[PDB]
């Protein structure tokens, strides 16, 4: 009824909308890297260059 914007629908076949199975869960895959990048030695350096 909402698609036709009418309270009465004549006999027939109407295409209303679409369907799509929603995702079940979420996964994320990254390489087995554990070393943390040397942000400390670059940022926390006592003296910087010119």
């Amino acid at each position: 009824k909402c698609t036709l914007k009418s309270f009465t629908v004549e006999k027939g076949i109407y295409q209303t909308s679409n369907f799509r199975v929603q995702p079940t869960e979420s996964i994320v895959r990254f390489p087995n890297i554990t070393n943390l990048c040397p942000f400390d030695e670059v940022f926390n350096a006592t003296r910087f260059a010119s």
Binding site: A45, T46, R47, F48, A49, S50
Partner: protein, 111 residues
């Protein structure tokens, strides 16, 4: 972490020439640099700091050049009074460093 070498080991040139010393770094140290001279039986004295600026009371014959990795110390004219050992100091990062100063370079002037 920071290691340097100083070359040449020794130089010899008559009174009218120009003597030059190379101080090279494993990784770049920017301008941060200092050149030191010690007479025998005498503590070292600062000659060039920041690799470019002349020290106090030092004659205008010693020139420091280069930036980053390669640094050169050039003397326009010798007078047989600069015959001594020269060192270059990293003065950049000394967290875990065996020696802030580099190798020894003795200057020999034959007059």
């Amino acid at each position: 972490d920071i290691v340097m070498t100083q070359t040449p080991a020794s130089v010899s040139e008559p009174v009218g020439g120009t003597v030059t010393i190379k101080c090279q770094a494993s990784e770049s140290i920017s301008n941060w640099l200092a050149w030191y001279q010690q007479k025998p039986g005498q503590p070292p004295k600062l000659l060039i700091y920041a690799a470019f600026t002349l020290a106090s009371g030092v004659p205008s014959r010693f020139k420091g050049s280069g930036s980053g990795t390669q640094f050169t110390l050039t003397i326009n004219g010798v007078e047989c009074a600069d015959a001594a050992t020269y060192y270059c100091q990293q003065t950049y990062s000394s967290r875990d460093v065996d020696n802030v100063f580099g190798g020894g370079t003795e200057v020999v002037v034959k007059g």
